[model samples]
Target: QQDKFLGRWYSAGLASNSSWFREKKAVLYMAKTVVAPSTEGGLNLTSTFLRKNQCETKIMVLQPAGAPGHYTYSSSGSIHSVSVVEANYDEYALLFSRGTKGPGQDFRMATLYSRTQTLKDELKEKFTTFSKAQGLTEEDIVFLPQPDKCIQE
Candidate 1:
């Protein structure tokens, strides 16, 4: 069952309240990710996205926390806590994350991942509701455009 979690996924939608996200949302495109198991019984996520007409890849390691679906990771001077809120192994996964960079620099994000580049409308609706519940405004939510470049790389 756990093996089902390891595979390729595409970013369907992302909702975040961070100032950096707000500024870059316009240029953001769909990101492709590969998830694999780590030696520590956690997850290793390698994601590729288009930036300035170039494909950039980022790797993150998530350490399992107290619960099965809870994880913690640190990156770029920020400590992040992530939770897999909803998922259907074959179709979609909904993740919620909160990060703290410094004093008064807290941000919340919700991500919708899909097995395919495009998802059903119902799933998108669900993502919107989940994002709203996470205290994100409608303006903060974005359904990333499918990028033709860097799909094979």
Candidate 2:
């Protein structure tokens, strides 16, 4: 499942605005994502789950990858069920925030990611439903603009 998301682009097309910042604003953008595979032999990871939002935030590599040993800005988000559900990436990075072993702050940063470049109208409503289900106001989110093509990344 994670492999499917790795090296792939999940996008939603909407003029995204950040309520976290200030009044509604727009940022037209798209993203390419790469997910981390659970490597028992490749890399053993202990993924911690968050009960509050069914979210995950902790990851550990039993062994290092290739030669150098360093934690890059990968998608260190945990696996919840079979679907990625949600993910986040670096504001300017071309990589997906899927695999990294680090503090809670790292994974929590994932709140800004998506599963596709464009969200279908039905899905947009669904997202609102999910957000509302999570005890958030429907107006809390500010939709952003997205491109038709997401593979350019």
- TM-score, per-candidate, Cα-based: 0.93, 0.39
Instruction: Tell me the lDDT of candidate 2.
Output: 0.36
| Cα lDDT, model 2, residue 124 | 64
Clashes of 1: 0
What is candidate 1's lDDT per residue for 1-153, written digit by digit as tens?
Answer: 557889899988999998878999999999999999977888999999999999899998989888788889886578799999999988999999999787788899998999998789999899999999878889999998999897762
Which portions of model 1 miss their true places by more than 4 Å? none
Best by TM-score: 1
Q: Give the TM-score of candidate 2.
A: 0.39
- Provide the global lDDT of candidate 1 against the true structure: 0.89
Q: Candidate 2 lDDT, tens digit per residue, 7-85?
A: 4334342211223223423333343434465444323333332223233335544333343222233321432111223
RMSD to native, candidate 2: 12.6
Cα error of candidate 2 at position 1, Å? 3.3
